[PDB]
Amino acid sequence: SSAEELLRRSREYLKKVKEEQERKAKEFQELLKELSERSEELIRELEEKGAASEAELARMKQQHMTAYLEAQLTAWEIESKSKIALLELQQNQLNLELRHI
Amino acid sequence: SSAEELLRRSREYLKKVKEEQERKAKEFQELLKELSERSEELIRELEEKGAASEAELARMKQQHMTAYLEAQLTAWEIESKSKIALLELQQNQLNLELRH
Amino acid sequence: SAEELLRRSREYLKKVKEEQERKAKEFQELLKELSERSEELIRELEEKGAASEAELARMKQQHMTAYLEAQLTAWEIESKSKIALLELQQNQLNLELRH
Amino acid sequence: SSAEELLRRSREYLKKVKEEQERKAKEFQELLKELSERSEELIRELEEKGAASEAELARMKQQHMTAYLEAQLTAWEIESKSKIALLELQQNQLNLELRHI
Amino acid sequence: SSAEELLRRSREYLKKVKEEQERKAKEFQELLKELSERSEELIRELEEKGAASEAELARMKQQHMTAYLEAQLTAWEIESKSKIALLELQQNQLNLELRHI
Amino acid sequence: SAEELLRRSREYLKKVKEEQERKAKEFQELLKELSERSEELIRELEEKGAASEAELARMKQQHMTAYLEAQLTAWEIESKSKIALLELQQNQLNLELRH
Amino acid sequence: SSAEELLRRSREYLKKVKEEQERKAKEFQELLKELSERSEELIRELEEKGAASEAELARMKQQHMTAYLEAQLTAWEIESKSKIALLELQQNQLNLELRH
Amino acid sequence: SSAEELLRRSREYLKKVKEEQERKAKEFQELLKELSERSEELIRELEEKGAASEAELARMKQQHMTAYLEAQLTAWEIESKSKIALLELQQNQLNLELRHI
């Protein structure tokens, strides 16, 4: 009863954290999408202006793609690590309930 | 009773740790906001002066956005790790409460 | 009740594992696309003589070096992810036999 | 009795380690503040003397903020990892206290 | 009986994960070999055409070996971490087998 | 016999903890020395006008930036080291009470 | 008996893992030796030609020694981590053998 | 008896690893000492030749001290991590003996 209430509060508190992680993951993708499209807009403007040397933009383009690639890998590593860690806490939570209940 | 004291004390201390980490998270967003808002202001100044080449300001702006993104990812990594460890510590606490 | 929770626990486990396969596949598609763009940019340069022979060598090697770094990183992620869930799959299996 | 003595001693040595880390955290903040204020001083002297181009100073100023943001994150990472790790040891200490004595 | 089925299945899924990592390890070596041989090709063309100074080529050649050494260490780090981690899971699987069935 | 092993186990534990304090102190002495050398080199430059005002600013900031990085690194090491042994000290204390 | 088979099989497999890691350690020292011996040869060639400034070869030599030192530290970190993990795994194995 | 023999073999095997770590630590310090003194010999030669600009050597010197500082920190981190990990295996070894024994 009282144990059922605490385990209840712990389970629903665990879900808010899980949903809180899903929020941050989406928020990052939106941020990266905006920044990446701002960078492409900058590089595109140069190509229109022709201000940047053909080699200059090639180096600029490859840096944009490289950092974007790097940004995704980091976000992939973070969310992957978070989801897996929460899952173990989901198992501990379940282990507590069955054993007690 | 005496065990009720210690376990209640631990719960409240965990509560303080959780709040201090929420502070540091918010404080960082405020710091990153200010500094980032300065960096955008500097690049604005350079644009209006035309004190940097068109390509150079493309490089500076993209470096600015790259560092902001790196910073957000790092703070996201720290807070995500903190919240989940405390979550495990809170489970140990809960298990003890149940144990008693 | 114990079976329902554990069955529901295995389903969420399955979704997480499946999702991790989703991201790994998506990355390889992203890597190939960006990789094929990068070699296209390098293609155009050499054809136009835009970059010096020394310049294109450093550019090509930067591209291969970045591609190798990307794979090793994605390898480390997917490798660690799969093994971490693998311990959770064993934790799940241990819970089931417990009942 | 000796269990109580050994465990009370444990409680104190662990209270000292915790205070030691609060001390190190403050010292770094004072350290970063002093050095970070030299940087602004060196830079203000440049802007005053006009000894760096408008872009050089902007690159220097954003370099300073970028390094400052990294120092805070890195210090935040250490103190956070330390506080959480010590927290778990206090839990073990608390578990022994309920058991051993 | 069902324990034996669940555990034998576990044994097989874990044998598949192990073979999968031996596969990934080889693929990388083939991958590194192909790209690493392009680098030597691009560089041999430079030395032939004399399109880089004596020092530039030396800096490029030592750059190539330095990156190659990093790729091996990094791949060695991953495969080693993977093999050891899987090894422990095989031990848990072996522990269950002695117990559950 | 159990007491001898555990007493001997605590002595080796003590040596390791003491040794870790030795390295932490030694590093701060190394850092200060190298740091004081570096600021001496920078001192000589500005006095001789060897480096431009812009040059010395970047040099000074590189030195402070490297010093900060060194401290954070040594902080992370000594902090992690002490906590890791602290769990081993608790493991030792748990073994003793077990007897 | 049947348990004696499995635990003996695990001991021999652990034995193979320990040996494969000794291989990789030695193989790396051989690779680092060759490449490092090439790098020293290149800098020798440059010295005899006088194809690089005196200061430049000081920078190149010091970069060469820095990378060799970084490489050794990394391989030292990998093997030190591997040997100690297997050592823990070998202890789990031993505990099982004792358990039976 | 037979257990006393296996635990014996495990304890002495643990000591060879511990001594093996002490070897690598010393070996590194010797290597760093030699390389560091080779670098100082190079920088010293330049100052005698005066080949390097007074600012050039100042940058060169600071890089030598910085990398040396970095090298020590890495070695400090490795040996510290190794010694602590071996110690836990020393505790597990002792725990196995007393319990069996």
XYZ file of N, CA, C and O in Angstrom, chain B residues 4-100:
388
model
N 14.728 5.948 10.779
C 13.858 6.868 10.055
C 14.511 8.238 9.922
O 14.347 8.916 8.901
N 15.260 8.659 10.944
C 15.969 9.931 10.871
C 17.013 9.910 9.761
O 17.021 10.779 8.882
N 17.908 8.918 9.788
C 19.002 8.876 8.824
C 18.475 8.817 7.394
O 18.928 9.570 6.523
N 17.520 7.922 7.131
C 16.996 7.778 5.777
C 16.235 9.020 5.333
O 16.272 9.374 4.148
N 15.540 9.693 6.254
C 14.907 10.963 5.917
C 15.955 12.034 5.643
O 15.796 12.851 4.728
N 17.037 12.044 6.425
C 18.121 12.987 6.175
C 18.737 12.754 4.802
O 19.028 13.708 4.072
N 18.932 11.487 4.427
C 19.506 11.185 3.120
C 18.580 11.633 1.995
O 19.041 12.167 0.980
N 17.273 11.424 2.155
C 16.331 11.849 1.123
C 16.408 13.353 0.899
O 16.404 13.820 -0.246
N 16.478 14.130 1.984
C 16.528 15.581 1.861
C 17.852 16.038 1.261
O 17.894 17.016 0.506
N 18.946 15.347 1.589
C 20.236 15.703 1.009
C 20.264 15.395 -0.483
O 20.741 16.210 -1.281
N 19.758 14.223 -0.879
C 19.576 13.942 -2.299
C 18.742 15.030 -2.960
O 19.031 15.456 -4.084
N 17.696 15.491 -2.271
C 16.864 16.565 -2.798
C 17.688 17.818 -3.063
O 17.500 18.487 -4.086
N 18.613 18.146 -2.158
C 19.463 19.315 -2.361
C 20.391 19.120 -3.553
O 20.598 20.048 -4.345
N 20.965 17.923 -3.696
C 21.861 17.653 -4.814
C 21.122 17.812 -6.137
O 21.646 18.401 -7.090
N 19.900 17.285 -6.217
C 19.117 17.420 -7.441
C 18.887 18.885 -7.789
O 18.901 19.260 -8.966
N 18.667 19.726 -6.781
C 18.381 21.131 -7.042
C 19.635 21.892 -7.447
O 19.583 22.739 -8.347
N 20.768 21.601 -6.805
C 22.017 22.255 -7.177
C 22.374 21.963 -8.629
O 22.935 22.820 -9.323
N 22.059 20.757 -9.108
C 22.355 20.416 -10.495
C 21.416 21.141 -11.450
O 21.826 21.543 -12.545
N 20.151 21.320 -11.059
C 19.244 22.131 -11.864
C 19.737 23.569 -11.950
O 19.639 24.205 -13.006
N 20.273 24.097 -10.846
C 20.884 25.421 -10.872
C 21.988 25.487 -11.919
O 21.948 26.315 -12.836
N 22.989 24.610 -11.796
C 24.124 24.643 -12.710
C 23.675 24.542 -14.161
O 24.253 25.190 -15.041
N 22.644 23.740 -14.432
C 22.127 23.638 -15.792
C 21.577 24.979 -16.264
O 21.910 25.452 -17.357
N 20.724 25.607 -15.450
C 20.155 26.898 -15.819
C 21.236 27.966 -15.906
O 21.280 28.744 -16.867
N 22.118 28.022 -14.904
C 23.198 29.003 -14.919
C 24.002 28.917 -16.209
O 24.392 29.943 -16.778
N 24.260 27.699 -16.689
C 25.023 27.546 -17.921
C 24.257 28.115 -19.110
O 24.827 28.829 -19.944
N 22.963 27.801 -19.210
C 22.158 28.348 -20.297
C 22.171 29.871 -20.271
O 22.180 30.517 -21.325
N 22.178 30.464 -19.074
C 22.264 31.917 -18.973
C 23.638 32.415 -19.407
O 23.741 33.422 -20.119
N 24.703 31.728 -18.987
C 26.047 32.104 -19.414
C 26.204 31.941 -20.920
O 26.686 32.849 -21.610
N 25.815 30.779 -21.448
C 25.908 30.551 -22.885
C 25.065 31.550 -23.664
O 25.435 31.938 -24.776
N 23.936 31.981 -23.100
C 23.102 32.967 -23.780
C 23.814 34.312 -23.868
O 23.900 34.910 -24.946
N 24.338 34.798 -22.741
C 25.048 36.071 -22.738
C 26.215 36.047 -23.717
O 26.243 36.806 -24.692
N 27.190 35.165 -23.476
C 28.373 35.110 -24.327
C 27.990 34.938 -25.794
O 28.517 35.630 -26.672
N 27.066 34.015 -26.077
C 26.613 33.835 -27.452
C 26.013 35.124 -28.001
O 26.195 35.451 -29.179
N 25.288 35.870 -27.162
C 24.700 37.125 -27.616
C 25.757 38.204 -27.809
O 25.566 39.113 -28.625
N 26.876 38.127 -27.082
C 27.998 39.011 -27.379
C 28.623 38.650 -28.722
O 28.878 39.523 -29.561
N 28.890 37.358 -28.932
C 29.531 36.915 -30.166
C 28.731 37.347 -31.388
O 29.305 37.819 -32.378
N 27.404 37.205 -31.337
C 26.576 37.669 -32.443
C 26.689 39.179 -32.613
O 26.675 39.690 -33.739
N 26.802 39.913 -31.502
C 26.948 41.362 -31.578
C 28.267 41.751 -32.234
O 28.305 42.661 -33.070
N 29.361 41.077 -31.869
C 30.648 41.354 -32.497
C 30.570 41.162 -34.006
O 30.973 42.040 -34.779
N 30.061 40.009 -34.446
C 29.951 39.740 -35.876
C 29.038 40.753 -36.547
O 29.244 41.106 -37.714
N 28.015 41.230 -35.837
C 27.195 42.311 -36.369
C 28.039 43.560 -36.590
O 28.026 44.149 -37.678
N 28.796 43.967 -35.566
C 29.682 45.118 -35.699
C 30.594 44.976 -36.911
O 30.732 45.906 -37.714
N 31.231 43.810 -37.059
C 32.121 43.599 -38.194
C 31.371 43.741 -39.514
O 31.891 44.320 -40.475
N 30.147 43.214 -39.583
C 29.373 43.299 -40.817
C 29.085 44.751 -41.183
O 29.273 45.163 -42.334
N 28.629 45.548 -40.211
C 28.278 46.934 -40.503
C 29.511 47.745 -40.879
O 29.440 48.636 -41.733
N 30.649 47.457 -40.243
C 31.889 48.125 -40.608
C 32.448 47.620 -41.930
O 33.215 48.337 -42.580
N 32.087 46.409 -42.338
C 32.799 45.760 -43.416
C 34.274 45.671 -43.084
O 35.126 46.012 -43.907
N 34.585 45.237 -41.863
C 35.961 45.109 -41.400
C 36.540 43.723 -41.644
O 37.732 43.511 -41.391
N 35.729 42.782 -42.121
C 36.173 41.437 -42.450
C 35.618 41.045 -43.815
O 34.512 41.446 -44.186
N 36.404 40.261 -44.557
C 35.984 39.798 -45.874
C 34.644 39.074 -45.766
O 34.272 38.548 -44.720
N 33.903 39.058 -46.880
C 32.633 38.331 -46.901
C 32.835 36.861 -46.550
O 32.067 36.286 -45.767
N 33.869 36.235 -47.118
C 34.154 34.839 -46.808
C 34.598 34.675 -45.359
O 34.245 33.686 -44.705
N 35.380 35.626 -44.843
C 35.852 35.529 -43.466
C 34.690 35.523 -42.481
O 34.675 34.729 -41.533
N 33.705 36.403 -42.684
C 32.557 36.427 -41.783
C 31.708 35.169 -41.934
O 31.029 34.766 -40.984
N 31.725 34.543 -43.114
C 31.112 33.226 -43.249
C 31.840 32.210 -42.380
O 31.208 31.372 -41.724
N 33.173 32.281 -42.356
C 33.951 31.389 -41.506
C 33.735 31.704 -40.033
O 33.635 30.790 -39.206
N 33.656 32.989 -39.682
C 33.479 33.358 -38.282
C 32.089 32.978 -37.786
O 31.947 32.437 -36.683
N 31.052 33.248 -38.584
C 29.696 32.879 -38.191
C 29.567 31.372 -38.006
O 28.968 30.903 -37.032
N 30.115 30.595 -38.944
C 30.013 29.143 -38.853
C 30.803 28.605 -37.667
O 30.382 27.637 -37.024
N 31.950 29.217 -37.361
C 32.673 28.851 -36.148
C 31.859 29.195 -34.907
O 31.839 28.430 -33.935
N 31.177 30.342 -34.924
C 30.334 30.722 -33.797
C 29.232 29.695 -33.565
O 29.003 29.258 -32.433
N 28.532 29.304 -34.632
C 27.460 28.326 -34.495
C 27.996 26.949 -34.128
O 27.318 26.191 -33.424
N 29.202 26.606 -34.587
C 29.780 25.311 -34.248
C 30.123 25.228 -32.765
O 29.887 24.197 -32.124
N 30.687 26.302 -32.203
C 31.022 26.304 -30.784
C 29.767 26.298 -29.920
O 29.706 25.589 -28.908
N 28.760 27.090 -30.293
C 27.491 27.059 -29.574
C 26.902 25.656 -29.576
O 26.373 25.192 -28.557
N 26.983 24.963 -30.713
C 26.443 23.612 -30.802
C 27.280 22.634 -29.989
O 26.736 21.753 -29.314
N 28.607 22.771 -30.042
C 29.467 21.940 -29.209
C 29.183 22.182 -27.731
O 29.126 21.235 -26.939
N 28.994 23.446 -27.345
C 28.717 23.762 -25.949
C 27.409 23.128 -25.492
O 27.344 22.511 -24.423
N 26.350 23.273 -26.292
C 25.062 22.689 -25.930
C 25.165 21.176 -25.780
O 24.614 20.599 -24.837
N 25.862 20.513 -26.708
C 26.031 19.067 -26.615
C 26.757 18.676 -25.333
O 26.408 17.676 -24.691
N 27.773 19.447 -24.946
C 28.527 19.130 -23.738
C 27.664 19.296 -22.492
O 27.613 18.407 -21.635
N 26.977 20.434 -22.372
C 26.078 20.630 -21.240
C 24.968 19.586 -21.241
O 24.522 19.136 -20.177
N 24.505 19.191 -22.429
C 23.519 18.120 -22.528
C 24.100 16.800 -22.037
O 23.405 16.008 -21.389
N 25.377 16.548 -22.330
C 26.013 15.321 -21.865
C 26.178 15.329 -20.352
O 25.963 14.305 -19.691
N 26.548 16.477 -19.783
C 26.763 16.564 -18.343
C 25.451 16.368 -17.594
O 25.353 15.529 -16.692
N 24.426 17.148 -17.948
C 23.159 17.076 -17.229
C 22.480 15.727 -17.430
O 21.883 15.182 -16.494
N 22.545 15.178 -18.644
C 21.978 13.857 -18.885
C 22.660 12.805 -18.019
O 21.998 11.915 -17.472
N 23.984 12.897 -17.875
C 24.699 11.959 -17.018
C 24.358 12.182 -15.550
O 24.155 11.218 -14.802
N 24.294 13.443 -15.116
C 23.992 13.734 -13.719
C 22.601 13.236 -13.346
O 22.435 12.490 -12.374
N 21.586 13.647 -14.109
C 20.213 13.287 -13.778
C 20.047 11.778 -13.663
O 19.291 11.294 -12.812
N 20.749 11.016 -14.503
C 20.558 9.570 -14.524
C 21.308 8.888 -13.385
O 20.839 7.875 -12.853
N 22.473 9.407 -12.996
C 23.182 8.846 -11.851
C 22.391 9.062 -10.565
O 22.130 8.113 -9.815
N 22.002 10.310 -10.293
C 21.147 10.589 -9.145
C 19.898 9.723 -9.166
O 19.454 9.228 -8.123
N 19.308 9.537 -10.349
C 18.157 8.651 -10.470
C 18.488 7.264 -9.937
O 17.681 6.653 -9.226
N 19.680 6.753 -10.259
C 20.111 5.477 -9.700
C 20.323 5.588 -8.197
O 19.931 4.692 -7.440
N 20.943 6.680 -7.743
C 21.132 6.880 -6.311
C 19.794 6.982 -5.594
O 19.621 6.431 -4.500
N 18.828 7.678 -6.199
C 17.494 7.746 -5.620
C 16.859 6.365 -5.521
O 16.082 6.106 -4.594
N 17.175 5.469 -6.457
C 16.638 4.114 -6.390
C 17.257 3.338 -5.236
O 16.555 2.606 -4.527
N 18.568 3.478 -5.030
C 19.200 2.880 -3.860
C 18.538 3.377 -2.581
O 18.216 2.591 -1.684
N 18.331 4.692 -2.481
C 17.621 5.253 -1.336
C 16.254 4.602 -1.173
O 15.916 4.097 -0.096
N 15.454 4.600 -2.242
C 14.122 4.005 -2.186
C 14.187 2.555 -1.720
O 13.394 2.125 -0.877
N 15.125 1.779 -2.271
C 15.267 0.389 -1.852
C 15.516 0.291 -0.352
O 14.978 -0.599 0.317
N 16.332 1.194 0.195
C 16.571 1.190 1.633
C 15.287 1.504 2.395
O 14.952 0.828 3.374
N 14.553 2.531 1.953
C 13.287 2.867 2.598
C 12.356 1.660 2.617
O 11.800 1.304 3.663
N 12.175 1.017 1.460
C 11.415 -0.226 1.415
C 12.011 -1.256 2.365
O 11.287 -1.919 3.118
N 13.339 -1.407 2.340
C 13.995 -2.388 3.197
C 13.603 -2.195 4.655
O 13.454 -3.170 5.399
N 13.431 -0.947 5.080
C 12.998 -0.654 6.442
C 11.483 -0.489 6.500
O 10.734 -1.402 6.152
